[PDB]
Paper text:
Mammals depend on dietary uptake of Cobalamin (Cbl), which is a cofactor of at least two enzymes that are part of essential biochemical pathways. CD320 is a member of the Low-density Lipoprotein Receptor (LDLR) family, a large group of mostly multi-ligand receptors involved in cholesterol uptake and other physiologically essential functions. CD320 features an N-terminal, extracellular fragment comprising two LDLR type A (LDLR-A) domains separated by an epidermal growth factor (EGF) homology domain, the exact function of which has so far not been determined. While the majority of related LDLR domain-containing receptors bind multiple and distinct ligands, CD320 has been reported to bind TC with high specificity and affinity as evidenced by the lack of interference in TC binding from related LDLR ligands like LDL and RAP as well as high affinity for TC of both the full-length receptor and its soluble ectodomain81318.
Deletion of a single glutamate (ΔE88) in LDLR-A1 of CD320 has been associated with Cbl deficiency observed in patients carrying the mutation. To investigate whether a structural effect was underpinning this defect, we generated a complex of TC with CD320ΔE88, characterized it biochemically and determined its structure at 2.6 Å resolution. However, the purified complex displayed increased propensity to form non-specific multimers as analysed by SEC, requiring an additional SEC purification step for crystallization. As the mutant complex structure was of lower resolution than that of the wild type, we confirmed the positions of disulfide bonds and bound Ca2+ ions by using anomalous difference peaks from data collected at a wavelength of 1.77 Å. The TC-CD320ΔE88 structure revealed a similar domain arrangement and binding interface as the wild-type protein and we observed no significant changes in TC or the LDLR-A2 domain, ruling out a gross structural effect of the ΔE88 mutation. As seen for the wild-type protein, the region of LDLR-A1 carrying the deletion (EEE loop) revealed poor electron density and higher B-factors when compared with that of LDLR-A2 (average B-factors for LDLR-A1 and A2 Ca2+ ions ∼112 and 56 Å2, respectively). Moreover, electron density for the Ca2+ binding residue Glu86 as well as Glu87 and disulfide forming Cys88 (equivalent to Cys89 in wild type) was missing. However, the centrally bound Ca2+ as well as the LDLR-A1 acidic necklace was clearly visible in our structure indicating intact Ca2+ binding. Even though the apparent Tm of the complex was slightly lower than that of the wild-type protein, approaching that of the LDRL-A2 domain alone, the mutant protein bound TC with equivalent affinity to wild type with a calculated KD of 1.5 nM. At least in vitro, these findings rule out a compromised ability of CD320ΔE88 to bind TC.
Residue numbers in the entry:
A (entry chain A): 1 to 68, 78 to 409
B (entry chain C): 53 to 85, 129 to 171
Amino acid sequence: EMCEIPEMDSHLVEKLGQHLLPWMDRLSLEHLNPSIYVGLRLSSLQAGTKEDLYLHSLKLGYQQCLLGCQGKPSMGQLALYLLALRANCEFVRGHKGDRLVSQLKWFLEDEKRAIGHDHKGHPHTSYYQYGLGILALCLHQKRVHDSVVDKLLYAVEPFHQGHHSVDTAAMAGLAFTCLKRSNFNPGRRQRITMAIRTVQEEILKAQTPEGHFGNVYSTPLALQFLMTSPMRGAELGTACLKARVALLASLQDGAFQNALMISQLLPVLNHKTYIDLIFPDCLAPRVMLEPAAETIPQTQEIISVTLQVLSLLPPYRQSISVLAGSTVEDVLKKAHELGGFTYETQASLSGPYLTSVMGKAAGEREFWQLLRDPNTPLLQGIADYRPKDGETIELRLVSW
Amino acid sequence: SCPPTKFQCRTSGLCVPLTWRCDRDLDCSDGSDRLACLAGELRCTLSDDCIPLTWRCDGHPDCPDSSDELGCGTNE
Ligand code: CNC
Ligand SMILES: [Ca+2]
Ligand SMILES: [Ca+2]
């Protein structure tokens, strides 16, 4: 059947938008987020004249730093900037536009070379950004060579190496879908068609008993992909409705507070996906967002959190006291304030990313993994996860 | 209502740099605005730029002078 998510409560949706609203005023290149802009335009919600200023900031930052800063955007972020142009019914154009396109095309070419004629090699980034970059170029009707598409095809086709997340598979499917709708790689038409089906079954098989596809935060992008095509022979309808039940429970439980996650979910709640950026409808009516007038309550409770790092000699294990409601990053900050602990973060569209712990920076295909007790990886980053009293947070350097 | 080392625009008033002015494209509003190539690569005609062979005749001008998208199209 077909993947359909029946509309939800307008108040739940507006609540999501209000989380997104403060970011509309944060125009610092460190804070600028093309994904927020895309997600807001594809939604039923609107920020009014704030949007135009946000877009202008994106145009300033991205075109001056990539063609000229502090930390110019990555190529993956450039791809999302391209999606933002489409969200405003623009095609990338002119000499700056044309050169930005070629930069992204260089990104894919380098990543293709890294993967190799062999297909063992990893991308310097991820297959997620690989798929995202193909999608971005396709949405602006820019063609990539068959050999570039082949890498994404081989990554999901039968007897592929590695294992990919639902998120990564969904982004691949979105790329494939854009190629198919645009008739862009006729020499790979039949393989592209088969890849889309493959991604669909991989995603449905990844559906948990609670209803989510992988986890709660993979469900939005997965639903985006599933919504773009019908699935005959399969029971897509029931799968998507069970995903809705899971999604709804997570919303009412406050699972979606991170801005980029909201920006990936809002299109779904408006029956739209990134594929709607092929033929965008920029003038479709959207409800204006006003600031939530909500009085934030101040806690009076102290909680203690055990912070531990066993990846380093000598190991670190300390009980850190913070106000109830604090984030992991607050715990980290307080550990640093007590002495004996240090760390580093870098900016990303999902917020602060943990790069270094106590002098040790994650190397190639390594990262600092966040875990809680017992041996359970967090589903949120240091700025979003809020530990309970008595919980133990581990920072573990892992290879993937 | 704008700065000295930036431009101003007349319909949005959103100020714009002026290494953007005015560079044959509409950044504003209104309008008041040798090192041998690697194997498998290809050199541009009016410059030193190198591009993968697969970017020749792919519908987008990757060379500053669009050398790669001239002689399109062939047959075979
Ligand atoms: C690949 C990827 C994936 N990951 Co990771 C996973 N698993 N991630 C990152 C990878 C980065 C390295 C790499 N080679 O790219 C990788 C494999 C190490 C990974 C690790 C993180 N991930 C994890 C999560 C939970 C986040 N990640 C996602 C962005 C999940 C993503 C899926 C998704 N839906 O986005 C994902 C598929 C694609 C992200 C991307 O490239 N976006 C496009 C890119 C152009 O935007 P960007 O902002 O510039 O990308 C950077 C950031 O995304 C940063 N980053 C990656 N993950 C996070 C998570 C947070 C919370 C923050 C603040 C930044 C990041 O790394 C990217 C640069 O390489 C998120 C959806 C994944 C998910 N389904 O759970 C999720 C985030 C959930 C949320 N509520 O925000 C970890 C927290 C796991 C853990 N318990 O340790 C961990 C972050 C630890 C830390 N040091 O802060
Ligand atoms: Ca100009
Ligand atoms: Ca070309």
